[PDB]
Amino acid sequence: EVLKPRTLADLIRILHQLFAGDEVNVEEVQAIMEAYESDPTEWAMYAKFDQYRYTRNLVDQGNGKFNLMILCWGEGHGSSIHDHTNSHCFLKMLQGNLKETLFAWPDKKSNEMVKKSERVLRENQCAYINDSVGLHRVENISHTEPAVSLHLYSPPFDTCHAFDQRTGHKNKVTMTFHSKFGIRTP
Ligand SMILES: [Fe+2]
Numbered sequence: 001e002v003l004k005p006r007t008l009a010d011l012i013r014i015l016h017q018l019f020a021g022d023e024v025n026v027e028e029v030q031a032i033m034e035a036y037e038s039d040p041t042e043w044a045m046y047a048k049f050d051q052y053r054y055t056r057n058l059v060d061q062g063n064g065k066f067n068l069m070i071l072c073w074g075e076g077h078g079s080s081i082h083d084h085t086n087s088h089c090f091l092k093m094l095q096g097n098l099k100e101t102l103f104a105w106p107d108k109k110s111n112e113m114v115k116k117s118e119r120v121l122r123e124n125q126c127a128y129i130n131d132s133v134g135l136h137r138v139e140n141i142s143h144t145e146p147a148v149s150l151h152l153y154s155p156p157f158d159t160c161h162a163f164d165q166r167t168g169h170k171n172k173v174t175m176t177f178h179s180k181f182g183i184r185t186p
Contacts, residue, residue, distance in 0.1 A: 004035040008042040012060050012068065019065040019154055026128055030090060033152065034126035038094040040148075045182040046070040047148055053077060054140075055178035059150075067156035069177070073098065073147040078139030080162035081113065082173070083131050088154045092126040096140060096147030100127060103135040106168025113165045121149075135163060 005011035011033065018029055040047070046057040047070065054077045060068040073096070081103050091098075102117035116134055120141060121127055129136055140147040161170040177185050 002031045002035050005032065008036065011036045015066065015068065015152065016063060019062060024088060024154060026088065030126045030128050033090055033092045034124060038124055040095065043070055043094060047072055048179050048184065049074055049146065050178065054079065056175065058177050058180040066152055066154035069151050071149045071151055073140040075146065076140060076143045079137055081135050081137045081165060082160045082162050083135055084129060085157040085160050086131055087157050089129045090126055090152040092150040093121045093123055094148040094150050096142055096145050097121060098138050098147050098149060099141050101137045103137065105135060106163065110167045110169065113163065113168050
């Protein structure tokens with residue numbers, strides 16, 4: 001019963017429709033992103049890796065309503081524990097596997113941060129998070145293979161917080177793009 005995009009281009013077109021209004025049906029977006037069968041012939045132009053850290057590669061600016069990007073995780077690469085600046089966040093596997101670790105939010109007190117959930121995102125699976133769900137950290141499960149994920153944020157945001165797992169203290173972080181529309185950035 002779910003609308004199945006046949007290409008990454010179909011998916012983008014559907015997303016433009018589902019985010020045209022004021023109401024976002026989270027479960028419907030998630031199902032449609034999941035239904036798209038990752039095809040590396042369609043997204044290899046965005047798959048630009050770096051040796052030391054994961055890269056963020058803008059695919060579509062979603063008419064200001066959302067950002068759609070591809071994240072490329074080298075061998076062993078992982079993220080910090082971060083929030084999502086009051087946005088919706090969808091992340092779909094395109095290649096390999098990510099481990100998502102969900103954390104509880106810290107208090108004012110300093111303390112080791114608490115894990116609320118731990119899972120591996122399967123092939124083509126679409127996960128969802130926002131700040132009310134919790135914080136998370138995401139990482140390539142593999143030290144011999146890369147991972148590639150498709151992320152949708154609505155509204156778009158260019159800053160978030162990184163969290164120290166030992167204390168819960170946080171720092172503001174400005175996120176950058178490694179490339180946009182297949183073109184490397186400065
Ligand atoms: Fe995230």
